[PDB]
Amino acid sequence: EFCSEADATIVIKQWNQIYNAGIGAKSRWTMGNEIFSSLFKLKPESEVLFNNVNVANMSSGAFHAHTVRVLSGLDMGINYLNDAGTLTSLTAHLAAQHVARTGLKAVYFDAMGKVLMTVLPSLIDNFNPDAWRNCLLPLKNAIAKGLP
Amino acid sequence: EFCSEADATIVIKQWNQIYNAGIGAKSRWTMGNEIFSSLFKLKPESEVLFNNVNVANMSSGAFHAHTVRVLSGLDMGINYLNDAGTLTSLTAHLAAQHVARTGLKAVYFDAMGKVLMTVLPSLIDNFNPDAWRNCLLPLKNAIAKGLP
Amino acid sequence: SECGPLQRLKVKRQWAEAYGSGNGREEFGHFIWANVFKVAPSARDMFKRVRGDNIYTPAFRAHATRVLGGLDMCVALLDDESVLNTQLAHLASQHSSRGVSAEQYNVVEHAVMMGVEHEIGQNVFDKDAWQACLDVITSGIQGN
Amino acid sequence: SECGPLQRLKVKRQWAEAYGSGNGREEFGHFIWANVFKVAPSARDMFKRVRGDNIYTPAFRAHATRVLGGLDMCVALLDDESVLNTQLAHLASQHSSRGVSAEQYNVVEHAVMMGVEHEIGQNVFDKDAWQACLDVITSGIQGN
Amino acid sequence: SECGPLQRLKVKRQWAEAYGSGNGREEFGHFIWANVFKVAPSARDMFKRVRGDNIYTPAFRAHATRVLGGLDMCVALLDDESVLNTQLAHLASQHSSRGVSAEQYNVVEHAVMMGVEHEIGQNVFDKDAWQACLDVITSGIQGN
Amino acid sequence: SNSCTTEDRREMQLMWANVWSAQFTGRRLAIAQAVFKDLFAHVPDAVGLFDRVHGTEIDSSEFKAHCIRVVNGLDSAIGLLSDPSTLNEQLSHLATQHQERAGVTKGGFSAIAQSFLRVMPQVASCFNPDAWSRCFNRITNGMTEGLAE
Amino acid sequence: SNSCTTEDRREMQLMWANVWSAQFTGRRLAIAQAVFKDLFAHVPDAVGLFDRVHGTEIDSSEFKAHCIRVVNGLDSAIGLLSDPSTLNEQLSHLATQHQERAGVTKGGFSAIAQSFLRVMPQVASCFNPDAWSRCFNRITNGMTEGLAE
Amino acid sequence: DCNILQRLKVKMQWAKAYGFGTERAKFGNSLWTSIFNYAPDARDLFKSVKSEDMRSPQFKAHIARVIGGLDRVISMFDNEDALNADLEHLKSQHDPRGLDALNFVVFGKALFATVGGQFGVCFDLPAWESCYKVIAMGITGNDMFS
Amino acid sequence: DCNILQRLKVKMQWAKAYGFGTERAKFGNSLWTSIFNYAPDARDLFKSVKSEDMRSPQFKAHIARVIGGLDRVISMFDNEDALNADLEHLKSQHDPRGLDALNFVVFGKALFATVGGQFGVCFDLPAWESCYKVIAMGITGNDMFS
Amino acid sequence: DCNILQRLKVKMQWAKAYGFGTERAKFGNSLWTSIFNYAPDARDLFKSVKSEDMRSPQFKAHIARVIGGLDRVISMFDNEDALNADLEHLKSQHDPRGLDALNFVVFGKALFATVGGQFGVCFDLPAWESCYKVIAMGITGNDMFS
């Protein structure tokens, strides 16, 4: 399942351009804040789901750590695209974490996908929307599996 | 006899630029018509030797097939430049075919050589008139051997 | 010089070498249009809809693809006068409401020529054959 | 276009690629300044003390080193507005008694952009991000 | 700067590197003359007999060969003032009935300099040595 | 999955280059004319959509030029499979060119897809119909975004 | 055959580069002066053809400059053996430069050919006189097209 | 059969299997080794070109002419007027030799084995069988090639 | 006619072309790619083995069963009793499917293009045509393979 | 300890030893093989992620989450507010599991051996011991990590 080995290789290389162990955390949450600010403009009713991590102040340490946690999970899924067995278990775990949160709709993940497809070309050299779509959409559906 | 291996390699490579098994027949007879139109301007009394292949209409299938036959024979001689034994037998056969045609003078082949030396640089990248002269002149004399 | 049968064959082979199969087409088109707008910066305003201000965008790169595709069809038709003139008339109608000057067609001519030479080398570029046959193409696009 | 947070990250990574570690910095700076003085030959007179007449000399190559170092500090500070504006004010005072025109800052902008693209390739060069963020830098050096 | 004994030795070695043995001489001469006619398109009319309209032809390439050969003789004679001045007088008579301006000699000077630098690299090109010694050559061809 | 992968893109470009004639329209025209012949035989009312280019006269100069345009458009899309950002822009331009010509629908593109699948194995060596169709559909999906079924 | 082949062209350029001095006229002048010394000794009436360049004074500045011109001309032709299209143009220019100077004939070029054949082995390592002469004659054939015997 | 698509396909596969230079002579030798292995009696028909020694210059010259004839005929597959004129020309040359048309069947099978063996698994045998029939029919006129 | 010498030749060339390990699966995929390229309508006859996706395990299993059938029949070429018993067993499996025997002609051509493309220019097309007929006659019973 | 210079040093050496792609999973496997070799009793604590089979997708997923947690925490070494918030988050997840803090000492020694073995002789063990204490103190709150 998921995406092909050549498509995954493109996504992994392009992702590591802008995210790796050597990237400072400030760049991480700058991307994180751009992503979630864009998400709240598409689905404004989803911002309330993040009250527990102080979304009222996206410059706080609590919300900064949230976006760092989110992008680390996205980085984890990307780097395991060529390991379908492990990626299945990884996305099942992420799905259970999101299902148990009352208020999450599957269309919020659809909106997150569009945010990523919009923000990433601004950061990545020669963004490949086809390879990313082939890999990120099964990733999104696997994480959104079970949400209403 | 004929020409050196390095000169033949140049002629063969440059000839295959404009003539090979992948070139359409239309390009073949376009070159063929340019060559024979130029020949008839130099030696106008030689055009009558081609009445049997409908030279009166150089767009006919009969004359188109003639120039295709002529350029195929020229292609055959070129591709056997590094096989002096076979090229000798090939040119002896072509010579007998032309000797048995009443009206062919050796100077018609001299004029054909000048036509080729004029037309080919218009078609070939970096035409080498020295390598071509070293290889085509013994080819011409071998085919014109016996004509008055 | 004239765009005779021999020149058409030469331009066909040299174009096929420079245009290629697809890998180098992006760089090929970028080199050409960077030359166009450098020589004629006033021409960018005609390309507002395709982001003539920024030839690095996917929008302009797709326009460059269409232009080179139009050249490919003309070059491939140089040995077919009847179909060539029909296709040139189509390109003519595609530019009729845009006010392209004869000076601007010559600017693109020179850029395509520099682009082809840059791709295949000054060592083999046949300037006379390319100038004469591009004149045949552009004069037909100009309804002439 | 605007020099937003995403554009600043992109300009940072592309600059780091073009500027490099030190090996290609001489050629990088030479390409830029050969473009500057070709487009604006009247600008060489401002560089008499650093041999603007001969950009091949060690004297001018050291000036080119300082200019690219100044750009490096600004690019590295694009995500730190407070310290960036302080450093831009320092560059402002370093040019205050020299009468650099706004047209001349744009000439160096375009040369740095051509230099970066020449180093990393037209295939990836982000013209909109570079133009917007260089505008932020130069307008700050101009005391604006 | 002056074309002293040390500058003459440097120009000799750098010329020998750029001019080479013969393989790269065609590209070398093409780069130079493409620069000449781009900077001074009005100069092509003086070269009607050698197809100045098309520098890709064998006719002009042979003229470029003679020009670079003339430069080679002058450079090789830079350390022999007596024979150098005699050869410069020969080049003077070869241009006397052609009305070459001093501005045109400077255009070819800059093209030869760009051609040499393009061949050996900006990293080593000695602009001061080349400008001073080319001035010695051209001023002698101008009967000065 | 039915996605046009990077591997599939490499296969389609080989299947296409092995049959493409870079210098002469002989191959391009024969491929295109055979496809529209197949399409018209299977969709007889499709011939009327090409009245301006002499659809009823497949050998006319007007339809020969149309065939070369279509083949040029497909060549551009197949090559742009390597750069999908630019491909998306080019497919949008093709969509508007086909947009709101009454009888030009998504059903006609599904028909011409089967036309290519019957023509290509007769002219192409090592034809992979699975990989061809996944990327042909990827291309036609962008071409028919704003068309009726 | 006596044709100057591609192989012969490579050999002449090696025989020439091994002796060419790219920076100083010391070698070029010594080669040229030795050739004209040989020519004048064998053809005493040839010295009069070079009155304008002080043929009688081989060490004069006027004849030294002439020697460098001749050597420059031969260098250009030997290098242009790799591009005979341009070579043909250059040999025509040299032909007119020697054309219809009364005593400049094809016999004088045959004499200077023997002059080179005696000078070159004394200065050149691995000299191949067979391959040298086939391409030297190829060059002089173009230089003497419109000259008397 | 042998429609325009099969003619183009045959044209592409031929150009690949035929090659350039000395590979042309190697292809021709394999073709004629197969003809004489498929039907050893056919060898005696070529004593005029010294078929008793297949590396002699006389038979190599015959090989070159024959495969050169295949090349030009295949190249004219897209022009009926020129193709039929040349096929008539070949027929007038072969008719006085009183050849059993069955050996033109042998020729085709040796051609298929040689082209297919050189070109690989994507060799289109039905297209080659159909379009070779057009060639053998033009040269012989025998109803066996309909 | 497929005599004993032709049977030995076909067994030889099959073993070389068929190969070992994953070369057999690759050979099988080329054969069925050619079958469906030679006759696209024959693909619908194999819905029961999921011919819609030739990379599916169901169709790759069918490929392995077919070439395993070819391998075992070819190996039995030298024993009339065992060979005809297996051809009748294969006939009993194919007869209820009501197959057009013309598809067995298409099968033969794809087999020739695959074995010949793998084996090379010394592929014996006449011997394979004669001996494949024996196989097709045994499976279909149609006298077009007589 | 764990000053800003040690935090940057640890950040550099981690990024080198951690790598990209599948080398990330290999690093994680060596880390957890060492944890279970240093203290085989700790393996029974991870039955919920199927630690009885360390190549199962369930335990590979656990490995990925843990080293992903190390990566994000190390990346936030330069921002106290974000670092402490995430360490509090990890503490709230680990507290209900009633873990013996001694196994966090084992974890650190297995981390040092794995990073140092991958990074080479320039591994800065005092910096890693000091800065790992900051991590284990945030996750456990145990005075053993002061």
Ligand code: HEM
């Ligand atoms: C690729 C997309 C996404 C990824 C990789 C992702 C991953 C994660 C991760 C790793 C966590 C932290 C779990 C933990 O350690 O406790 C988290 C928490 C959360 N996510 Fe997602 N997520 C994604 C999309 C979304 C979207 C679209 C929403 C829309 C509402 C969402 C809502 C939440 C919420 C509410 C939390 C908990 C916040 C809290 O701690 O109070 N996520 N997500």
Ligand code: HEM
């Ligand atoms: C490189 C130069 C030439 C080549 C390779 C060549 C080769 C050939 C070939 C292959 C044929 C066909 C023989 C056959 O299949 O029956 C032919 C026929 C002929 N050639 Fe040449 N030839 C050359 C030059 C010339 C020239 C200069 C003349 C001048 C008159 C000439 C006159 C003819 C004639 C009259 C025929 C017969 C036309 C007919 O079929 O009615 N050829 N030549």
Ligand code: HEM
């Ligand atoms: C010289 C050969 C040329 C060729 C082969 C060519 C080809 C093309 C093609 C195929 C299109 C797409 C038309 C469409 O899809 O609607 C186009 C559009 C256009 N061309 Fe050209 N063209 C040429 C010359 C020029 C020149 C010299 C100019 C102006 C200096 C020009 C300006 C334009 C403009 C403004 C458009 C419309 C862009 C848009 O879609 O907004 N063309 N051209």
Ligand code: HEM
């Ligand atoms: C656009 C970004 C620019 C940057 C980052 C930059 C940076 C610098 C730096 C670091 C110095 C060294 C100052 C010192 O050490 O005293 C300098 C000097 C100078 N710059 Fe700029 N500069 C820029 C634009 C320009 C422009 C556009 C011009 C003129 C067209 C210019 C003209 C000069 C001059 C005349 C000097 C003094 C040279 C000397 O030491 O004699 N600068 N610049």
Ligand code: HEM
């Ligand atoms: C700067 C160093 C120059 C050198 C070494 C040089 C050398 C030469 C040489 C050796 C010739 C051949 C003369 C002959 O064989 O009759 C020549 C011809 C010529 N040169 Fe120059 N030249 C120089 C500058 C220029 C410039 C600056 C111009 C004009 C802008 C120029 C214009 C010409 C012309 C018109 C010819 C005659 C071309 C013909 O044969 O029709 N030269 N030059």
Ligand code: HEM
């Ligand atoms: C991959 C499939 C196709 C491609 C690449 C393609 C491409 C093109 C191109 C390049 C043009 C020329 C537009 C212009 O130059 O202005 C065109 C015209 C057109 N196409 Fe398509 N096309 C495809 C399929 C279809 C189908 C399936 C239909 C209808 C069922 C269709 C209907 C038309 C029509 C009506 C025109 C207008 C022709 C005219 O009057 O000029 N196309 N197409």
Ligand code: HEM
């Ligand atoms: C490979 C052999 C030769 C070469 C490359 C050569 C080349 C040259 C060159 C380059 C010049 C200078 C022309 C100019 O700059 O205007 C020249 C002049 C001349 N050459 Fe030759 N030459 C050769 C042999 C000969 C021979 C054998 C003779 C007489 C028997 C001869 C007679 C002359 C004369 C009379 C001049 C005129 C000198 C003057 O007054 O400037 N050359 N030659």
Ligand code: HEM
């Ligand atoms: C497509 C199939 C064939 C082609 C294209 C072909 C072509 C040719 C050609 C070009 C020549 C030389 C004509 C000349 O220049 O004099 C020739 C001669 C000849 N061919 Fe064919 N040939 C074919 C098949 C055959 C077959 C099957 C046979 C006999 C079994 C045959 C028997 C001969 C003979 C005996 C000669 C005369 C050899 C000689 O010069 O003594 N050919 N053929």
Ligand code: HEM
């Ligand atoms: C010519 C040599 C052929 C051989 C040696 C062969 C062999 C086989 C074998 C071994 C099976 C599996 C029987 C079983 O285990 O149930 C099979 C099944 C089948 N064969 Fe053939 N076959 C040949 C030709 C053909 C052709 C030409 C067709 C149709 C065009 C065909 C149609 C089928 C079908 C439909 C099945 C059923 C597959 C299934 O649903 O399991 N066969 N064949």
Ligand code: HEM
């Ligand atoms: C710096 C050291 C450590 C870090 C950064 C870390 C991080 C993590 C993370 C990210 C998770 C997954 C949370 C989730 O998404 O549900 C986790 C789970 C867990 N950790 Fe830790 N861990 C560390 C050390 C330890 C140690 C030393 C132990 C026990 C000896 C331990 C026991 C567990 C257990 C039992 C789980 C739950 C596994 C499950 O999902 O069933 N951790 N840890």
Ligand SMILES: *[C@@H]1O[C@H](CO[C@@H]2O[C@@H](C)[C@@H](O)[C@@H](O)[C@@H]2O)[C@@H](O)[C@H](O)[C@H]1NC(C)=O
């Ligand atoms: C939003 O938060 C900004 C970040 O400051 C850090 O986080 C806050 C929550 C405190 O913990 C502070 O000590 C940290 O330095 C603040 O700078 C900013 O003032 C806050 N904005 C508002 C409106 O409260």
Ligand SMILES: *[C@@H]1O[C@H](CO[C@@H]2O[C@@H](C)[C@@H](O)[C@@H](O)[C@@H]2O)[C@@H](O)[C@H](O)[C@H]1NC(C)=O
């Ligand atoms: C010359 O021939 C042209 C080519 O047409 C083809 O050849 C002729 C001989 C006929 O066989 C014809 O059926 C073929 O299509 C003709 O188009 C042209 O009219 C002819 N010219 C003259 C003056 O008759």
Ligand SMILES: [Ca+2]
């Ligand atoms: Ca024009």
Ligand SMILES: [Ca+2]
């Ligand atoms: Ca600006």
Ligand SMILES: [Ca+2]
């Ligand atoms: Ca000067």
